[PDB]
Amino acid sequence: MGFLELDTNLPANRVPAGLEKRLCAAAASILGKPADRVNVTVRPGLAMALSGSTEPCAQLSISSIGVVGTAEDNRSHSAHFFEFLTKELALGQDRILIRFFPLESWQIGKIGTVMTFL
Amino acid sequence: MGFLELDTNLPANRVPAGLEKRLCAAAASILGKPADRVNVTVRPGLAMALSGSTEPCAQLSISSIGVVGTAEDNRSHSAHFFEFLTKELALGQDRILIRFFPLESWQIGKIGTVMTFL
Amino acid sequence: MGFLELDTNLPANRVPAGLEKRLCAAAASILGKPADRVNVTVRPGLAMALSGSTEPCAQLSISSIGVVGTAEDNRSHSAHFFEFLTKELALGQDRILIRFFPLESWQIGKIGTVMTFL
Ligand code: NA
Ligand code: NA
Ligand code: NA
């Protein structure tokens, strides 16, 4: 399972509509998951500085069981997510950063239990 | 100490008013803490996909010193938080997920120090 | 590199304008980084309880490579961030909490790779 959170200082009406769905599909493909095991949250209109600058930017966080635990894996993911997001948001590559967080099954609550038991 | 963050794509005017307080009380009871050691943040009106779907949903994160570090503990918490949130938000159990994060006292800043020293 | 996220239940028009920039500068100084290696996200207008109370409050999270991994380091940071934020937000010291999260270079995506390779 994958969880993506995207904070941006672009106003909601400057984020291309439906981005949460397209990022869900992109993340399924990049991380190697079916679309029904991917989650995306987009939070626009925030006040942000990225690398010291308040120019338009976005911060992506990716959490996942399994696939985000090494530099080699995350370098690959990063290349693809930067390509996707720079194009969608009309941002330079200097205006996006990503954080990757490994998760374990005992940490994910699903249908009233945790994934350890599913 | 417990910290709960709830993201939802329900508009603010569709989230039952006061949910942050009722979730604080529920989390105190579920996690085994007095209400004054529990924190809740609700972020409505977001653009979200959960399990690949943009239908109404919510994502809960629970961070805590002590009580969220095993599958057995988190299964118990999950059952109770799913019962609470499905009813409050009028959501099916397929429309909520939870992530659990253990914290340590050196990670929590309180009154200008950290909890290690309190 | 440092990442700060600040959630508050103060409405956007009650947060002193430009706080994301001033917090970026403060965090550069406190954490020992140049301003171009610091990131800040402010999310106002949220529904929050802190220590069981829905009175005005703020939650700060600080993630960083290197400097947030011990009680001694975080006690020092906490004193300075509490001084900065209590004054900016006109909040008592009981109305702010901080969480600190160490990061490693393989977890940070930057310019289409990860920091391990930069
Ligand atoms: Na997280
Ligand atoms: Na967190
Ligand atoms: Na984080």
Author numbering:
A (entry chain A), B (entry chain A), C (entry chain A): 0 to 117
Which sentences from the paper describe this structure?
Mutation of Pro1 abolished activity, supporting the critical role of the N-terminal proline in the HPP enol-keto tautomerase reaction for MIF-2. The P1G MIF-2 variant has no catalytic activity because of the dynamics of the glycine and the altered pKa preventing it from functioning as a catalytic base, which is also observed for P1G MIF. This conclusion is supported by the F100A and S62A variants, which should have the same proline pKa as wt-MIF-2 and possess catalytic activity. We were surprised to find the initiating Met of the P1G MIF-2 variant, as it is cleaved by Escherichia coli methionine aminopeptidase in the P1G MIF protein. Crystal structures of MIF variants and substrate- or inhibitor-bound complexes typically display very few differences, and consistent with this trend, the P1G and S62A variants have RMSD values of 0.30 Å and 0.32 Å with the wt-MIF-2 trimer, respectively. Proline 1 mutation has a large influence on the MIF-2 structure in solution, whereas the F100A mutant had more modest chemical shift perturbations by comparison. The P1G variant logically perturbed Phe2; however, it also caused broadening at Ser62 and chemical shift perturbations at Phe100 and selected sites near flexible loops and the C-terminus. However, subtle elevation in the dynamics of residues 20 to 30 distal to the monomer–monomer interface and decreases in residues 60 to 75 surrounding the allosteric pathway along the solvent cavity are observed in P1G MIF-2.
pmcThe human macrophage migration inhibitory factor (MIF) superfamily, comprised of MIF and D-dopachrome tautomerase (DDT, also called MIF-2), is broadly and constitutively expressed with involvement in proinflammatory and host antimicrobial responses. MIF and MIF-2 are highly similar in structure, with monomeric units of 114 and 117 amino acids, respectively, that form homotrimers. An evolutionarily conserved proline at the N terminus acts as the catalytic base for a tautomerization reaction of unknown biological significance in both proteins.
